[PDB]
Each structure stands twice: as structure tokens, then as C-alpha cells.
Amino acid sequence: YRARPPPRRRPGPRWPDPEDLLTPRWQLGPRYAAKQFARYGAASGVVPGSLWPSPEQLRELEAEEREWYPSLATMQESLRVKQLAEE
Amino acid sequence: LTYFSARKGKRKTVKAVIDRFLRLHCGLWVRRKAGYKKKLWKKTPARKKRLREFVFCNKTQSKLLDKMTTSFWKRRNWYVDDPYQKYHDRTNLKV
């Protein structure tokens, strides 16, 4: 008997139907398309410009990083201040 | 005690031994002697320091603590300037 054909990964991206509920939302998410781009090259048809953050996303990111992660100047300033206090 | 979890189906540690004891990768356990901060005025100083000092544990309660704790607390850790690296590993032992 000829053996059944060898099972193989589906060639090409996997673009599900968004108007289909049982399909999870993490496929419709953009990170999915980014993964498919990085995997199957530009053949996916995904626009490259979409993966970068929008200006709003960049704004929130710079805001949170400026708020939480300080800079070297302020860092060394606080170091000097606390060292002087200890002294 | 909780040999199988409800959400993941895994063992679960009691944080009691985590707060009270310490494990060394050799398989040993240390502990702060009890009553080391209570009623120090009546106790003689030799007793005070016998209470202050660390000590080890029996093999029985050692393996009991091991049984209730999980492998995360039995793993090798490389801390910075942690004084117990001198003692995690054993030297010049037989039998």
C-alpha cells in the first residue's frame, strides 16, 4: 500500500475570518500579523509600517518611561544628595 | 498538605518554613534558635548567645521540610555578596 502523504505545516500565513466568533482575538490582534510577517517574509502582504507604534502609543510610552525610569543626571544628583546626607 | 493544587495540579509550599528556615544546596537547613529575643534580662549571657547563634537541623525534619517545600527552594542560586555561599556546598566529607 502507498502510505498516506506526509503531514506538513500549512504553507503560507493563516488569516482567519474576523467575523467568526470561535476564532480567538489574539489572531485578529496585530502581534499575530507581525509574527506572520517575521516568519514568512513580506509574502504575507502585511504592511510593514503597521508594526511600529502609532504617535499616540509612542506618546504614552515616553510619558510612562519619563515618569518611572529616570535619567543619569537626576540619578547621580540623588546619589550625591543622599551621600551628603549620610556624611 | 496540598499534594495537588486545584488550579494547576502541582504541589504547593507552606510559607512558614520559608519565613523560619533556610536551605543550603547541600541539602541542609539552618534556623534561628527559639526564644532568642524573649526575656533576655534573666537569661545568662552564655545562654543569650546560644540563642542568638544559628544552628542546623536533624535529618528527619530536614527531609520533612524538603517534602513540604518545592524544587524552586531547593535549586542553586548565585546571589551577590550573600554570606551563605561559603556554606551552600560541602567540603571534606565522607560516609
Partner: protein
Amino acid sequence: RLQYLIDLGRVDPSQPIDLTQLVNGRGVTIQPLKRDYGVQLVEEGADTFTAKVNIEVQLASELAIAAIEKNGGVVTTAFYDPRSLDIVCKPVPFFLRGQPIPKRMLPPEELVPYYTDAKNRGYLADPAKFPEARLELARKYGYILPDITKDELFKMLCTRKDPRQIFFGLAPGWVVNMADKKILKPTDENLLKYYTS
């Protein structure tokens, strides 16, 4: 172990040694999920050591620094955060995501003096003081200071990455692709301003 790896020939000392090459040679496995900020050098193996390598590291003991400087190598520390260390120690899984090269960040409130001291060979420390520290270490451990300025590969030895840059070739904001191999920059003013900030 470093001598073992180099004389087995898995890591090329002619090429600048760094954490990526170490992890590819399997000299050290890393578990950033277990909050291991990197790799440290230790005093063991000072003898029988002829590396000459330009090792990149996070921690460094004075014995290892002195031995490498005696054999003519180069030692300098480089703080990586957990996520940066993850991208470094497993680059391909990150490139399968398609999101751009992240940016390193400065050390936390504690390790800035450490990575800024010159005796430490911190990448943030001044270069003007590195000769001084090399001189004190030589004067300490009784070995002449070999001027590596003469050899042909002083350029290789002084190849270094500035902070907020993961790889010697790549920079943050860059996007890499291997299927239909390409590299992509934004060339947008705001984006590049951020990725340089």
C-alpha cells in the same frame, strides 16, 4: 572554562567575545525568568590563561581583570536588564516576533556607581582613567602592562557598544527579517529621536 572553550575552538577569540557568543557556545546557560542579570568573572583559572580576548561581561573580579590585561585582553562590564538579556541570549525567537530592537536602559538606583567606576572597567566610566586602573593593577599583581596599541587588532580590542545599543551592528528601532533577508529603519523624525533617546 573560558580557556577550555577557546582551545576547543567553539568561540573565536579573533571576533569580539560577548554574551551572545558565549550562549551560542553553551559556555553558560541563562535563566532571565529566574532573574539572573548576567554572567560574572571569577578568580578561578588565573593560571594557565592566555586568552587575549575582548570579553564583555556584567560582573568582573580584579583577579580576572588583571589576568586578562596581563595577557593583553580587554575587560569591560555591561549592565543588561531582564528583557534586554532575554533578547540577547535568545535573539532568533525575538526576531520571529517582528517587533523592533528594544533599547537598553541605565542601571537601577544601586549599580550606577559600580558600572561607572573606572577600576571596575564600567562601560559608563571614563576612558581616561582606565589606563590608571590598569597601571595600579599591574603595580599590584607584579606584571608589566602590555601596550595593546601596537598590535594589528587593537581596533578589534577597542570595539565596544555604547549604552542603549544591544549589538555591535544593530541599534534600537531597527527591524530585522531573515525570511527574504532584509533590515528596516523607520526614517521618521519622531521615531528615530525616540530610539536615540
